[PDB]
């Protein structure tokens, strides 16, 4: 059972801008997704400070980067607080309408796309490098769900039948044909060292057979 939703007009316009604007500094997508993961890990850690049982779904707080050249996917896994189904439909837990408003005023006032994270909509920078994004998420208060969009004005949500996550979020980037450099180990290492050196959670870059 698959539900198809229309993006709010402002969010569709944000992703069309990300997809269509000539902008060579695409590597910042990884910084933005790791920062989102760090924020989600902060949230479940804070909740656990007064309720240890919040970590019954998994005590380890970390970020994994999983490239797969055969599938042409880069997956960012975290064990953060996750998202409910309502969070997913409500723009992945962002205030994306007002954030897009401010981002687009900043762009006409000198800003560039790399500053997208300062407006709370850094997730959508995934479409700098991905033709399709799948988000698998499990929140303590809900079931496991899969969100998916190839842009074009719509997204889908379904109950996920993949591997149980326990708790957290998995962002699967189905990379564009000309963006496979972000599957190479040395390129990912360079980006993490450049932009994510002070993230307070272990970031593990998986290797491939």
Identify which of residues 65 and 129 has a Cβ nearer to ligand A1AYN in the complex. Answer: 65
> Least distance from C-beta 74 to ligand A1AYN, angstroms?
11
Residue 36, annotated ligand binder?
yes
> Least distance from C-beta 142 to ligand A1AYN, angstroms?
17
The neighbour count for residue 113, using CB atoms within 10 Å, is: 17
Q: Which two tokens stand for residue 54?
A: 């919040």
Identify which of residues 36 and 100 has a Cβ nearer to ligand A1AYN in the complex. Answer: 36
> Least distance from C-beta 146 to ligand A1AYN, angstroms?
12
> Least distance from C-beta 177 to ligand A1AYN, angstroms?
22
Identify which of residues 18 and 65 has a Cβ nearer to ligand A1AYN in the complex. Answer: 65
Residue 178, annotated ligand binder?
no
Q: What does each C-alpha distance from 79 to 37, 42, 86, 139, 145 come to in angstroms?
A: 8, 10, 19, 10, 15
**Is residue 191 within a helix (H) or strand (E), and if so which, with residue range?**
helix 185-195
Identify which of residues 64 and 150 has a Cβ nearer to ligand A1AYN in the complex. Answer: 64
φ/ψ (deg, to 5) at 21: -70, 130
Identify which of residues 31 and 167 has a Cβ nearer to ligand A1AYN in the complex. Answer: 167
- Between strands 73-78 and 130-138, the pairing is unpaired
Q: Estimate the crossing angle of helix 96-108 against helix 9-20, to 10 degrees.
A: 40
- Between strands 63-68 and 203-205, the pairing is parallel
The neighbour count for residue 146, using CB atoms within 10 Å, is: 19
Residues of this chain that bind ligand A1AYN (CB under 6 A)? 64, 66, 75, 77, 165, 170
> Least distance from C-beta 77 to ligand A1AYN, angstroms?
4
Q: Which two tokens stand for residue 89?
A: 């439909």
Residue 123, annotated ligand binder?
yes
Residue 160, annotated ligand binder?
no
Question: Binding site for ATP: residue ranges?
Answer: 36, 78, 97, 123
| Sequence ranges of the binding site | 36, 78, 97, 123
């Amino acid at each position: 059972e698959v539900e198809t939703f229309a993006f709010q007009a402002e969010i569709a316009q944000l992703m069309s801008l990300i997809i269509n604007t000539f902008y060579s500094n695409k590597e910042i997508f990884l910084r933005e997704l790791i920062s989102n993961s760090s924020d989600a890990l902060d949230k479940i850690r804070y909740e656990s400070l007064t309720d240890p049982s919040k970590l019954d779904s998994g005590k380890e707080l970390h970020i994994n980067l999983i490239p797969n050249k055969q599938d042409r996917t880069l997956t960012i896994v975290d064990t953060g607080i996750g998202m409910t189904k309502a969070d997913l439909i409500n723009n992945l837990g962002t205030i994306a309408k007002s954030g897009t408003k401010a981002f687009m005023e900043a762009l006409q006032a000198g800003a560039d796309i790399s500053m997208i994270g300062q407006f709370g909509v850094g997730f959508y920078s995934a479409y700098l490098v991905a033709e399709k994004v799948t988000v698998i998420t499990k929140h303590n208060d809900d079931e496991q769900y899969a969100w998916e969009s190839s842009a074009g004005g719509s997204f889908t949500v379904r109950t996920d039948t993949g591997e149980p996550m326990g708790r957290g979020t998995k962002v699967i980037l189905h990379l564009k044909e000309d963006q496979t450099e972000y599957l190479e180990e040395r390129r990912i290492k360079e980006i993490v060292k450049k932009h994510s050196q002070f993230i307070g959670y272990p970031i593990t870059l998986f290797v491939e057979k």
